Design a protein around this ligand. Sequence first.
Ligand code: HEM
Ligand code: HEM
Ligand code: HEM
Ligand code: HEM
Lengths: 141, 141, 146, 146
Amino acid sequence: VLSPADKTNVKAAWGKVGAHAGEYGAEALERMFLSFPTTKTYFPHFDLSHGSAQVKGHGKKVADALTNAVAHVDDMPNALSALSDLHAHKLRVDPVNFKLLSHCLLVTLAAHLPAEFTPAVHASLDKFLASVSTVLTSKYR
Amino acid sequence: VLSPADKTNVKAAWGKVGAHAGEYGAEALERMFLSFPTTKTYFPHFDLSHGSAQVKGHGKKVADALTNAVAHVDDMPNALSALSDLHAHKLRVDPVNFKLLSHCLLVTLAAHLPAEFTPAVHASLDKFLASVSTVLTSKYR
Amino acid sequence: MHLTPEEKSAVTALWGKVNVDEVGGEALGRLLVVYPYTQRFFESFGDLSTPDAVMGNPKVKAHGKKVLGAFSDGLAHLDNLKGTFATLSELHCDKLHVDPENFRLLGNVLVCVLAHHFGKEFTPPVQAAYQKVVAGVANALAHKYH
Amino acid sequence: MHLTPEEKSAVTALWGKVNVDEVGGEALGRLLVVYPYTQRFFESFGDLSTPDAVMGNPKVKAHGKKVLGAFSDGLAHLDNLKGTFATLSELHCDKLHVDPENFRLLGNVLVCVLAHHFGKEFTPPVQAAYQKVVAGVANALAHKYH
Ligand code: HEM
Ligand code: HEM
Ligand code: HEM
Ligand code: HEM
């Protein structure tokens, strides 16, 4: 459950990400694929090599949804509805993977926002990603 | 999300447990301690020997909480307010443990409800135990 | 495996009473019902739209027999699961693209099926040994992933 | 836990620039902040109610030092993590009663802290290599639980 403080933290950190969102997105995916190889089982149709355009492209979509999620932090369920549909009915990614990607996004953020990645913001971001994750797998069964 | 069908399935199943609830809760715990030994780290003050008085006691308490949860399926956050608090601020049991106990509860039920434990009821009960777990750890952070 | 000699016997003794035909199909059908997202691997099996459609789908049952026969084979080699399943591990990664988390899901469903099937005979200690075996089989099957 | 020769180098090189003290206190404090339930073990440290409170607590700093000191010694023996951590493993279980899940959380927070600290040098491949190490260590420390 995001407090006002959390929402404040997130808006702030995502703010500094800004224009770089999509790059971080693709960075995070790469860190994931390398760190947790099992996640590659979901992208057999992808060129998973370094700088693959597919990964760059995918990473942009993922950053865009997150931006959309920060903008509607107070109504993620509705703001992310088509995406929760897609995940629940089409992609059907086992829920443990969300925790793997969330970890790699924090890693990305930490490595790019030294001044901004304080303990309190880290804590907020962790909670935010967990919430997006809950929304995305909310329609599994 | 518990649908009307899930709720009927749970009430039915649990109606059948009836008076054996405390006996099943003790059994579920014993099953958890034996299969997932790391769960014993939360009960260093308990005699975990078979048939121990602390296990039996605790077993009835868990069972009663579930009974209550079934009686208030439509109002769980409110019904389990006291437990959510207790777990979040005192006990502080890592959330993975909830998944272990739910599994052992389902196994106990399966071993005792030959007729009722159909795939549909099994799915309903699994969804119910995950909901209870979610309420109990909802105030963690 | 990392099972005591008492556990090893308990496992074997019970397994002898299992109808691999029947149990495989129930175990894979219940995986598909309880964890519907798992249906993702079986679009070619036809209709899995409802509990009943899943439970009575013959491809479900036949595949279950197959899975459980492979499972049964590793029981004869508790000591070299890694070895008994290396080929199957490679196949599941390289050819099928199955996230190994699914192996763990299936292991817990099977535990539930055995309990349902055996009742009181499936005691806490027997389940505990079976938990060790299903964990052992999921790890062996995840072993060649990369 | 298989580190290729290059992973080993990467791990080693970065670790030679780490100030255990500093990093230890930071990793332990972040743990306490992001996953507050982990404070259940450190009631005697005092007030851990605010991030500021946690991060500036000297007991948290000293403990972080102790923990990462041991961590650091294990890096010297990546070939025998199990034997190296056997005694600490038995201690955590029998005396401290620490759910081994916390070792996984601390490992992930540690990775976050090295990325924070090193920035761009903490590349995907370096992270992958550290991911293998923190899992190896968590597994070594959970090994003697019963
Ligand atoms: C923060 C969590 C996540 C977000 C915001 C997210 C967002 C998205 C978006 C926006 C799309 C594309 C929709 C479209 O183009 O129509 C997508 C597709 C996809 N996602 Fe998720 N996703 C998340 C987590 C995951 C995880 C953890 C995995 C698996 C490891 C995953 C696997 C996929 C796959 C395989 C696709 C389809 C890609 C393609 O074939 O083009 N996603 N996701
Ligand atoms: C199905 C989910 C659970 C329910 C419904 C539940 C319910 C309860 C209840 C009713 C109590 C007693 C409150 C009182 O003393 O009045 C309690 C206490 C406790 N629970 Fe939970 N619990 C659940 C999960 C867990 C798990 C998974 C663990 C750890 C593995 C756990 C560890 C404890 C401990 C250590 C206590 C205190 C025991 C004592 O010292 O008497 N609980 N729980
Ligand atoms: C005890 C765990 C498992 C064992 C021992 C097992 C074993 C097997 C075997 C022996 C085959 C056929 C090999 C061949 O083609 O020669 C197979 C195929 C397959 N398995 Fe697994 N399996 C297990 C778990 C799973 C799970 C949990 C899933 C997904 C939920 C899965 C998905 C598949 C698929 C999609 C196929 C191919 C079916 C076809 O031939 O069309 N398996 N499995
Ligand atoms: C990388 C993993 C870890 C290592 C290498 C480690 C190492 C240590 C060491 C060397 C000690 C001192 C033991 C002695 O007196 O000989 C210790 C104590 C302790 N550790 Fe662990 N630790 C780890 C993770 C954790 C975590 C994650 C927790 C809880 C979240 C924890 C809880 C404790 C506690 C409560 C003590 C006793 C503190 C005291 O008495 O002052 N440890 N640990």
